[model samples]
Structures are given as structure tokens and as C-alpha cells.
Target chain A: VSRIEQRCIDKGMKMTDQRRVIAQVLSDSADHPDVEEVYRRATAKDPRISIATVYRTVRLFEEESILERHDFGDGRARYEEAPSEHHDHLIDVNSARVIEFTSPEIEALQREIARKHGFRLVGHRLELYGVPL
Target chain B: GHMVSRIEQRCIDKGMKMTDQRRVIAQVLSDSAHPDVEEVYRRATAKDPRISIATVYRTVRLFEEESILERHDFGDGRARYEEAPSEHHDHLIDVNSARVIEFTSPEIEALQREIARKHGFRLVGHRLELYGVPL
Candidate 1:
């Protein structure tokens, strides 16, 4: 059982076989994947899984903060596990691949910018798009 | 016919079909930083109260496709936008106020290129959003 499943249980969400499978898939994915990718992986585990089930599971998990939803300027919504520490994504535009990295200096800069505007910086996100050099 | 006319002229230069709706939308985008469609509609309707929400929706997407505008999603269920930018910048959303602040950092841009180079890719473009709150 993934931590996500445990979190779902902790949140009082019903644990269906489909939900378990979807949660496991999300927990296993090290890459940011869109709904179709999640559906594909869910179906890989149990051919009986439906895209509707995947969508519902993702939305539910996202609401519970067990999943994090991202929109990297792409039409589709991409997702990943709600991480322990925050990091940013760098995307390969040519290949549609993602790489993760963290920048403390950037984090500090963000806090400063928000402070400049008289606001407390709470959260931030970044995605860098690229092609082969 | 202030800043709005400048964007109208850009629309003409791009050879876009000039409709009342697209003109208002293009003008709305010209004056916005990262406005969602609703904000666009609200501002547009302020000047011309008869514009339909459907027209605002259609025109925003149309201008977005024409590269005359940029679309964004800050997890608000609304596709936010700006007049297409030159060079590159990032966004920080003030959650409490639902306001967007645009900022540019040369070091951050340089670091992004270097990071992509490490992953064997050339930096092309990006979408960066920071969601935060008031102090």
C-alpha cells in the first residue's frame, strides 16, 4: 500500500480497488504525468480500470493534497505526488520530458518579491521549457 | 485610443480579422498582466457593456492561437492571459488578493539555460508561476 492510500484512509475516503490501483500508480510515478498517462498506467495494472475512475481518483487525491496538479502551459493538467519539500520542474519541449531541481536562492528571491509587495510568500512554482542544444 | 490603439495596430500588422470582440479582447490583453478570461470580460464590458461571454472566450483563444496573446493557468480553473511577451518572465500570484505580479530575473533565466544544458536540451520557453499570500 502506498502512503497515498494510507492518506486516503486517514481522510475517510472509501477505498475501492480502482482507487487503490490509481493511488499506487500516482505514488509510483516519478515523472509528472497528465491524465491520459495516468489512465494508461492504471489500465496497465488492471485492464478493468476506466479513465473516469482515474479522473475521479486524481481530482479526489488532489483535493486531499495527496496529489499536486500542475499546468505547465500545456492544454492538459499534469500531476505528481504532493511532495515533502518543494522543487521546480524543467521541461524538455522537444521530447515532452520533465526534470526536477531545487533552487534555494530562487526561493529566497520569491519571498523577497512578495515582501516587496507587502505580502507573505507562502508557495511558488516554476517550469523551464527547453530543446536540445 | 491610448495604449489600446498600439495593440490594435499590432493586430492589424499581424493581419488578424478585426472584429469588435477581438478588438476589445486584444485591447483588454494589451492592458493586462495576467488576466483570466473573466477579468478580460469584466474590463471589456466596462467599456462596452454588450459583449457576450462567449465572444470573450472565443476571442481570447483566437488571439492566443495567433500568438497575439499568451494563456496561463494558475490553478484557478480559468485560463489567464497577457499580451504576448517579448523575451521571458515569470509570474507570482498573490493568493489572498488574486493579483498577479510579473518579474524577471537574469540569474534565474541563465540558471534555467544551464540546467537544461545539463539535461542535454536548449532553453526555448517556459511557464513559471508562484502562488503566495499577504504578510
Candidate 2:
């Protein structure tokens, strides 16, 4: 029913009825959802959805890269749908809200440093944490 | 905390129950720069044949909970752990070899703060890593 379900089918995953609903819940989420939060949302639509089912489904999606997991320096894991474009995350230290941004200057510096060190740049990872001004 | 490794001492200070397995795990982590659970398990079992992968995972998790160890995700799908940093630094990974190099840049740190300020937020902390291959 959601775009995530279509992606799953495109990847040749056998999506059952419950799996479809779980996909929809993730698709509808703007904020990153952990397993516990996913279970809370999925069970709201279908009271029969169990926490273990959510855990297994989420793990499967992550393995297929249908979802991306983040640690964010918190004790728990968080998940978001894999993005179409590459970007870095800036997390709100106070509210746990994640904002995405791209800095050409920062990207340029990484390339420069890699070249200075006799390496060709492949990719980089960056995450920033901030509090409200 | 006497006669204990740095990590073991921290664990003791945190009031954690130290078992023989935890002591070995703590020793392995304290002696390494950045190692994943599997690597830690490998070294742990080399010293004590009875250690299991599950035990390493549990003790590592416990150490992180006590803030004696820090966990890192370097985009390799494997969680890596290290002692809490006394000074901040970033990593540059050799893509072909997977060897890690640590570097520091005050200019980049300043720009990070400036960027966060531009976005109406006060910068707290950041994680930066560069992945590359040999020229």
C-alpha cells in the first residue's frame, strides 16, 4: 500500500499482509522510528501486531537496505527509509529531531585532506548534534 | 581499582560486578584502539578459551551503559567500541585495507560550530569520518 511495500516487492521480498502494514507505517513516519516505536505505531492500526513481529520485520528491512539504521549516540537504535540522495544528519540534542544538510565546503575539505594524504576519496560520514539557539 | 586495567578500574568505579570474563573483555578493549565485538571476542578467546561471543557482546553493552566504553558506527554495519576519549579526533579509513587513521582539524571543528549557528542551533558534538583508497 506504501512506496516501501513496492520497493520490497521490487527487491523480490515475499511481503505478507502484516509485512505490508509494517511497511506502510514506516513509510508514513517522518521521524526515525526504533523497533519499540514501530511496534507502537503498527499495533495502533492492527492491534494484533506483536513486538517480536515488528523486530523481525525491521531487521529484515535493514538487511535489504530498505531501511537505514542509526545510533545517534543514544543507547537505542533508530531507523529511517534509505534516502535517494546522500546527506548528513544534524540531531537536536534536546529533542532528538534529526535535520539533514549538505556542506560543499566540508565536502571539499575532505577531498583536499584525502589528496594531501595520498588517497583518493571514496566517501565520508558526518553527524552533528546541536541544541536550540 | 588497584591492579586492574583502566577499563576494569572504570567498571569498578561504576559499581559494576566484575567477573573473570568481564576483566578479560575489559583488558582486550583497553589495549586496542577500535575493535568490533567479533574482534574483541577473538582476542578474548585467545586468552581464555571459555569466553563466548555472547558474553563479549553482553559485557561490551554493559561497559557502554556505564560510559566506560564508547561505541562507534563507521558505516561498516559493525559496531565498534573504544575507551572514552580524553581528546576528540576523527577517523580516516583506508577503504581497500580497512586500516583506520585518526586525525584532528581545528579548522573543521570551527566550521562545524559556525554551520550549526547558521542553522539556529548551538553545536554540541559531531562525528566525522573519511573513507578513501590509495592513490
Candidate 3:
């Protein structure tokens, strides 16, 4: 079983054929896709798969930390496999593209900024918008 | 000499129609730190009794599309609005207090550019919101 499939079973998500198919799609995806993309790819694999099931699966996966949902200042929510090491997104304003990268210094800096203000940085989101130069 | 005419000037530049209601709604949004639609509607009606809730909704929708305002979903049933042009900082929301703290770090900004450079995409715009807890 793939790691995503294995993890879903570990999390007690029912091992429906549809969920397994969706999990496989997300597991192999290198690009961050919104629900529509997920549904399209899923349906292409199995014509019986419903978009609503894809939506529920992604949300459920997100709630369980199996997936991360992003709002890149656009209307739709995008999904990525939850990473062991965190990263932030930079969006292209001209094309509405999302690129993910990690900066340890900045990650450390966020924790410091929170502590300096008498708060703990439970979580932080960092996104940058810029044109390719 | 109103608290929000400068923002109205921004609206005008965007070719938005000018009316007393749109002006008042824009005024309220300009003056607020992070107000939801109901808060905006209340403040607007206080200033101009003829302003309806529907007018506030339409005006906010228009402004949001124009990029003159920023709409936020802080995991609330209601969305919040803040004026645009928060050029150098992002918000860190206190989960306990539901308060927003704005901060800027040149160190952080520099890292974003460096990371994007490593990724081969020129940066454009980003939404960065931090959720924190009080010590």
C-alpha cells in the first residue's frame, strides 16, 4: 500500500474504493490542486466517483493533518500533502500560480516574533506575491 | 473633511460610482481596523440613515473586487474587511482574544524573496496570516 493509503487506514478513514482512488491521486500529485482539479482527475480514473466525495475526503484529510489546505488569495482552496517539514507559498499575480519553499531562518524568526510580543506562535502562514524577475 | 474621503478618492480612481451610501460605507471601512459587514452596516447607517444593508453588501463587494479592500476569513461565521495597502506587514491573529496584531520583519521579507529565487518564480503577492496564543 502507498503511504497515503496506509495512513488513511491508520486514521480509520473508511477504505472505500473511492477514498483509495482519491488518496492515490493526492499521493502522486506534485502540483497543488484545488477541489475541481482533484475531482476531475478522480473522475477520469473512475467515472462513478462524485465531486462531493472528493470534497469531503479532502476536508476530512485536512482535518486529520493528512493534507494542508491553502488559500492563495484566490477564491478556491488548494490542497497539498501535509509535509513533515513546513513550507510557505509564493503566488504569481499575473498567472495565479503557487510555488512552495521553506526558509528555516524565517521559520525561526516567526517563533521569535511571537515570543517577543508575549505570545507563542502556535502556527503561522507565510505567502509572498511577486513577478518572476 | 470626512474620515474616509481619501479612500473615496481611491474608489473614484477605480471608476466606482460615487453616491452618499457608497461614500459612507467606504468611510466606515476606512476607519475600522477589521470590521465585519454587520459592523460596517451599523457604522454606515449611523452616519447616513438612508443606507440599507444591501447597499453596504454591494459596496463592499465592489470594493473587494477593486482591491481597495481586503476580505478576511478568520475562521468566523462572518468575514472581516481591512483597507488595502498594508504594504510591509501581515497580521498575527490572537486566537484567544480574536485580536489582530500587525508586525513587519525585514528579515522575514528578505527570506521570502530568497526562497522564491531558489524556486525560480518571481514573487507577486501573498496572503500571510499567523494564528497565535498569548503567553
When 2 and 3 are scored with TM-score, the better candidate is 3
Which parts of model 3 have CA positions greater than 4 angstroms off? Answer: A1-3, A6-14, A17-87, B1-87, B121-127
Q: TM-score of every model?
A: 0.46, 0.48, 0.49
Clashes of 2: 0
Name the top lDDT candidate: 2
Please provide, for model 2 over A1-133, each residue's C-alpha lDDT reduced to its tens digit, 9 standing for 90 to 100: 6878987988999898789989999999987788888999999999998888999999999899888777645656888787664677676655555566788888888888888888998988787777789
Name the runs in model 1 displaced over 4 angstroms: A10-12, A16-87, B1-89
RMSD of each predicted structure = 11.9, 11.5, 11.2
Q: Candidate 3, after superposition: displacement of residue A133 in Å? A: 1.8
- Which pairs clash inside model 2? none
DockQ of 1: 0.26
What lDDT tens digits, residue by residue, belong to model 1 across residues A7-88?
Answer: 8888898899989989888878888789999899999999999888888889989988888786644645798777676677
Clashing pairs in 1: A120-B134, A120-B135, A131-B122
lDDT measured at residue A62 in model 3 versus the true structure, 0 to 100:
86
Please provide the root mean square deviation of candidate 1 (C-alpha atoms, Å): 11.9
